[PDB]
Design a protein around this ligand. Structure first.
Ligand SMILES: CCCCCCc1ccc(S(N)(=O)=O)cc1
Ligand code: NA
Ligand code: NA
Ligand SMILES: [Zn+2]
Length: 257
């Protein structure tokens, strides 16, 4: 099956997922000079006060922090979006070294990691129906740079020892995702896709301009996770990012002047 190694990584995905060569694939390089400020874009409305985290799972590709998406608790609205998108999970992509790891790039700059908060459009009723639509998902992307520690990330870091290998999960209740945001909600937006198989073209991407800082020790602990299952040869979970894809017939819009 698919992965991020030389024999199953991004250059191979198109064989089982031909949409990998589609017209609105993600991630992309954000050329800051040619992104055009759109004064009609609204401020992002991030309403996470009632978020109910449930569990953290090593899925063999990253770790997902999962939320209760049965009801309208944590939602994303505004910005480029029409209607209401419910938070279902977040996860990260990161590198083996601080100089790589993000999926989106900014003027070709790679960040050490990238956080994806995944939301589905409530008009479609369930996540599974949302991923059959071109406006089914909204992913809020946040870059991570290495510097000072992010206090709101430490609870995530300190559970990773308990989900080292593929298929392991742990309770992860009462986690507040507001602690992962930067100060500013200024963003770029464009239409794209999931960045892993099945690579479905359902995503309104909202990528925040301002990175969050995390410490070297925090990202080092991400890199101690394993892609493999328990009892299998150890393969460190690093470099679980897809490179930038062709922009094709798309424009990236900026929320800020
Ligand atoms: C038919 C089931 C599809 C599950 C898709 C799960 C998924 C969610 C978000 C992302 S990402 N990295 O674009 O945020 C990738 C994959
Ligand atoms: Na442009
Ligand atoms: Na419920
Ligand atoms: Zn992702």
């Amino acid at each position: 099956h698919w992965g991020y190694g030389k024999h199953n990584g991004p250059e191979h995905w198109h064989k089982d997922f031909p949409i990998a060569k589609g017209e609105r694939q993600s991630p992309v390089d954000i050329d800051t000079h040619t992104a055009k400020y759109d004064p009609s874009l609204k401020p992002l409305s991030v309403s996470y006060d009632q978020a109910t985290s449930l569990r953290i799972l090593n899925n063999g590709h990253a770790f997902n922090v999962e939320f209760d998406d049965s009801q309208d608790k944590a939602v994303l609205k505004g910005g480029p979006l029409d209607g209401t998108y419910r938070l279902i999970q977040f996860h990260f992509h990161w590198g083996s070294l601080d100089g790589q790891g993000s999926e989106h790039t900014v003027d070709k700059k790679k960040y050490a990691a990238e956080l994806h908060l995944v939301h589905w459009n409530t008009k479609y009723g369930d996540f599974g129906k949302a991923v059959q639509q071109p406006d089914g998902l909204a992913v809020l992307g946040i870059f991570l740079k290495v510097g000072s520690a992010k206090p709101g990330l430490q609870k995530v870091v300190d559970v990773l020892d308990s989900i080292k290998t593929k298929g392991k999960s742990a309770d992860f209740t009462n986690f507040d995702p507001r602690g992962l945001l930067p100060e500013s909600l200024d963003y770029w937006t464009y239409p794209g896709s999931l960045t892993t198989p099945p690579l479905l073209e359902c995503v309104t991407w909202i990528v925040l301009k301002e990175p969050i800082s995390v410490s070297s020790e925090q990202v080092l602990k991400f890199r101690k996770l394993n892609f493999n299952g328990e009892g299998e040869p150890e393969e460190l979970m690093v470099d679980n990012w897809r490179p930038a894809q062709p922009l094709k017939n798309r424009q990236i819009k900026a929320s800020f002047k």
